[PDB]
Amino acid sequence: HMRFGRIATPDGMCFCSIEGEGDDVANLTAREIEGTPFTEPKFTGREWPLKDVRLLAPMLPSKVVAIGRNYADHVAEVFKKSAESLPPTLFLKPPTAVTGPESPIRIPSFATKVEFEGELAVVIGKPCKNVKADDWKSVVLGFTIINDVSSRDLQFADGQWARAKGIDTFGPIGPWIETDINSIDLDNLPIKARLTHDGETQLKQDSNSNQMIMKMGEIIEFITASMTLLPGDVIATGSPAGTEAMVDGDYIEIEIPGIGKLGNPVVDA
């Protein structure tokens, strides 16, 4: 039922549990675990307070499998078409896209109209194939947040979204993995995003997972019909409406209550 993370120390890296109230690192402690999150936790006895170390992406996924066009109004705002013509579709982000909390989103000069995309993410906890929708929870280790960073201009030019969504640092994940799955109600879970631009912060996405076109069980069944998923794999369940372009100097913060906050500065590469 813990929250699992990865940290870097003046020493070296490790998995950890994160303990402390709500979510403000100054109030947070990281307790080293012996192995990986995939078996009952062997704690070392070592802890640092979170402020004293650096939170990383909580996992190094073999792959990042994403559902595109899973929120009707997001389809509308991005493609300027109603969702009926443009159904949810599977795509991949490379592991090299992955980055952690507070890490910069590094935009290359050829990547324009780059938007954030706050999304609920699911971390797989066991090898699985041909999973039935209603059995979905059986394969999930926990929930986390992803920012599915996307160059709109590349998406449109390229046709295949892969490059547009797969540039280095285009996949912030974190801040940790919430394994208390039943604390999270998919029929009622808010997804928010706040963009700081020119020193001023505004609410951009403000929706709920209950707006998903393809529901959680359906997603897992859909994916695993085609591909085997492994422990550590991440599934991005789609972005709600409200996304917009970012530039050097901005800061973007995704919030999912019950999980926490995922924040990143934005810079030119």
Ligand X SMILES: O=C([O-])C(=O)[O-]
84 is annotated as contributing to ligand binding: no
Taking CB under 6 A as the rule, does residue 115 contact ligand X? no
Contact (Cβ atoms closer than 8 angstroms) between residue 178 and residue 40: no
Phi, psi for residue 142 in degrees, rounded to 5: -170, 180
- By CB under 5 A, name the one of 117, 233, 250, 253 that touches Mg ion: 117
Query: Closest distance between its own copies and the C-beta of residue 169, in Å?
Result: 10
Task: Return the SS3 of 50.
Answer: helix
Q: Which residues pair with 13 in a beta bridge?
A: 8
First CA to last CA distance, the chain: 38
Taking CB under 5 A as the rule, does residue 239 contact Mg ion? yes
Q: CA 215 to CA 38: how far, in whole Å?
A: 25
* Count of residues of this chain found to bind Mg ion when the rule CB under 5 A is applied: 3
Task: Select from 21-29, 63-71, 200-208, 260-268 the region that touches ligand X (CB under 6 A).
Answer: 63-71
The b/e string for 237-257 (b: 16+ C-beta within 10 A; e otherwise) is bbbbbbbbebeeebbbbbbbe
Which region holds residue 113: left if phi is over 0, alpha if psi is between -120 and 50, else beta? left
119 is annotated as contributing to ligand binding: yes
From the list Mg ion, its own copies, ligand X, none, which binds 159 (C-beta under 5 to 8 Å, kind-based)?
its own copies
- By CB under 6 A, name the one of 100, 238, 260, 263 that touches ligand X: 238
CA angle at 246 for the pair 106 and 253, rounded to the nearest 5°? 85
For ligand X, the closer of residues 171 and 238 by Cβ is 238
Fill in the per-residue mask, 52 to 81: x = in contact with its own copies (CB under 8 A), - = not in contact.
Answer: ----------xx-x--x-------------
Task: Return the SS3 of 1.
Answer: coil
Nearest residue relative to ligand X (C-beta): 68
Contacts to ligand X from residues 164-203, by CB under 6 A: none
Amino acid at 163: R
Amino acid at 29: T
DSSP-derived letter for residue 164 is H
Task: Select from 9-17, 183-191, 222-230, 258-266 the region that touches its own copies (CB under 8 A).
Answer: 222-230
Query: Closest distance between its own copies and the C-beta of residue 63, in Å?
Result: 5
Phi, psi for residue 81 in degrees, rounded to 5: -135, 155
Taking CB under 8 A as the rule, does residue 158 contact its own copies? yes
Positions in the binding site for its own copies (CB under 8 A)? 62-63, 65, 68, 86, 89-92, 94-97, 108, 110-111, 129, 158-163, 166-168, 225-230
Positions in the binding site for ligand X (CB under 6 A)? 66, 68-70, 74, 117, 148, 238-239
